[PDB]
Amino acid sequence: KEFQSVEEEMQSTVREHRDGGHAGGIFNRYNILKIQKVCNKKLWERYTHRRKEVSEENHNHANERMLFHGSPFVNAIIHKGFDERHAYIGGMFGAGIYFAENSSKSNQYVYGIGGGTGCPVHKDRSCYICHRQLLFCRVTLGKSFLQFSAMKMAHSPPGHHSVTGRPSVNGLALAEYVIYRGEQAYPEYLITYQIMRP
Ligand SMILES: Cc1nc2c(c(=O)[nH]1)CSCC2
Ligand SMILES: [Zn+2]
């Protein structure tokens, strides 16, 4: 039932992307192959210690959410954790770690920014053959700064613990959530899947 809940979140949050599938491929659903619960006690303690600290700074509320993260470095993340030292100021909300509430938005980043050159075997961003991996993460948002337009920051805004990118006509199509401290996310589930041909 635990993994069925994860499959449901993965499938139901798929959306039609404005780039016509350029970055992540053309699909309406996935073929979910594996769902593995990541058990990293040192990373979990780092996460819960920070979560308690954020809660005390946000009226006894962590404002935790389960969010997706796509990256070519998922295997490094499950072992070493999220690391803001690998984040650079170039992004929409600057040098943060980015998460999506729509799995298909995170799928656009599995092979790199804008989908890179796609899978290493066929160099195809819309590869239906190669197995992809996504993370479904615990993310502590705390006091989240609501923002619509690009704001390149190095750290959370003063008094805040994260940034929420909200959709707008000139801006974002879908929401995104940005943390500036790696310990504010835990890679709880490793999802192995394929995008499926419509
Ligand atoms: C690397 C990466 N970036 C983003 C996302 C992601 O999953 N990975 C989703 S929100 C937009 C940016
Ligand atoms: Zn491939």
Author numbering: 963 to 1160
Reported in the publication:
Tankyrase enzymes are now appreciated to poly(ADP-ribosyl)ate (PARsylate) a number of target proteins which contain a common RXXPXG ARC-binding consensus sequence. While both TNKS1 and TNKS2 knockout mice are viable with a decreased body-weight phenotype, TNKS1/TNKS2 compound homozygote knockout mice are embryonically lethal by day 9.5, supporting genetic redundancy between the two proteins. Both TNKS and TNKS2 bind to and suppress Axin2, a negative regulator of β-catenin, suggesting that they may represent novel druggable targets for cancers dependent on active β-catenin. TNKS1 and TNKS2 also differ from other PARP family members in that they harbor a short zinc-binding motif containing residues Thr1079–His1093 within the catalytic domain.
DR-2313 is a potent, water-soluble competitive PARP inhibitor. In DR-2313, the amide group is fused into the B ring, a modification that improved the binding potency. The IC50 value for DR-2313 from our study is about ten times better than the value for 3-AB. In addition to the three conserved hydrogen bonds associated with the B ring, and the π-stacking with Tyr1071, the bulkier S atom from the A ring also displays hydrophobic interactions with Glu1138, Lys1067, Phe1061 and Tyr1060.
